[model samples]
Target: KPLHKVVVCVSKKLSKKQSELNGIAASLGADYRRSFDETVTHFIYQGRPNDTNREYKSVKERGVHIVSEHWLLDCAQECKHLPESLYPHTYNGS
Candidate 1:
């Protein structure tokens, strides 16, 4: 589906594989953007298992999904949208 407008925002660690990430986004029929804004549907970063997916709209009622790069990777790997909530970044004060 050409419904996803992805904004790739990662650190230097994942920057080396920038093309790979961008390719995946474009291949997924998602519009690869260069910046973040209200028009962006998905904001992807970098993290690990510490994150949790799924948003209830309590935070960003605008409907933007704040997720990690893994979300994109997995979606491309699986050839489908694997639920954004299943890969959200949950940084609690633990």
Candidate 2:
């Protein structure tokens, strides 16, 4: 469950909740970076897909796992990284 090498990015829309997200990442031993970059492992986004800014677009294009904020909460609840199948963004029920 250790995530020492994991790098996470929080979208602007989700900035207000950064404190909570930071706590979750820290609990999992992951690193929280305010900006997106090639090293980022996850991009946690809030609001509609189009609402994301160009930075997200660039990151997505480069293959970062762009998941909903719910992904973080789910992972926190489980105390580990859940399989992608459990919270895929493409699934309407998600």
Candidate 3:
């Protein structure tokens, strides 16, 4: 059987991983590319738990919001606060 493993790391702050990846690709004389699969993608930021996985288009539409929110939450909780404010109006009226 082929093993497919994915590692997830939530950074408390921006670490420019994607830009780093792009740089690596460029160094290798390659250009970064993505495809919409329509099966493995999901949207979480809209607070509706939409399944948009494998859909590169959806990623372009909302992936960053989800990831950013996730990172902020992880950071906040790690600091013993709350993840709600990680995003504006996410957990409060403000």
Backbone clashes for every candidate come to 4, 0, 8
**TM-scores of the candidates in the order shown:** 0.61, 0.76, 0.22
Segments in model 2 whose C-alpha atoms lie over 4 Å from true places: 47-53, 88-94
lDDT of 1 by residue, 1-89 (tens): 53354454333335677677777788887776554455566766554464342332322465667666777777887888777777775
Candidate 3 lDDT over residue span 26-54, tens digit each: 34333333322333222222232443434
- The residue-by-residue lDDT of candidate 2 on 1-94, one tens digit each, is 5666678888776789988987887788888888776777877774444644665666668887777767777788788776544544433334
Best by TM-score: 2
Q: Rank the candidates by lDDT, best first.
A: 2, 1, 3
Q: Where does the lowest 10-residue lDDT sum fall in candidate 3?
A: 1-10
Runs in model 3 lying further than 4 Å from the true structure: 1-16, 33-94
Query: Which candidate ranks first by lDDT, i.e. highest?
Result: 2
Candidate 2 global CA lDDT score: 0.71
